[PDB]
């Protein structure tokens, strides 16, 4: 692909992160957290679901 | 005029299914899985992440 636009960045880094959820990884750290738009609450979104695994192994 | 524009569409799909995994529900379908683009690609990611919440259950 190519990197010409800061599009792909967050999109890519959102796959990471799924990945690491579905492993049962309750320490690596959502990205983006600090924004304000539309991919901010995504972000945040991601963070609460993560939240909710670490409740439910403990 | 907001409510007109296809953007939001998405990203609050996307926000509901995000509190339905929250929840431990096993059965909500996931939206724009047949999409081709970086926001299908995105869908897929959280179809996997349902699946493995399944599997954990189980």
Do not use: C, W, Y
């Amino acid at each position: 692909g190519s990197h010409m636009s800061t599009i792909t960045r967050p999109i890519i880094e959102l796959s990471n992160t799924f990945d690491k959820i579905a492993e049962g990884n309750l320490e690596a750290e959502v990205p983006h957290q600090n924004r304000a738009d539309e991919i901010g609450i995504l972000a945040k979104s991601i963070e609460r679901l993560r939240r909710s695994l670490k409740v439910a192994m403990e």
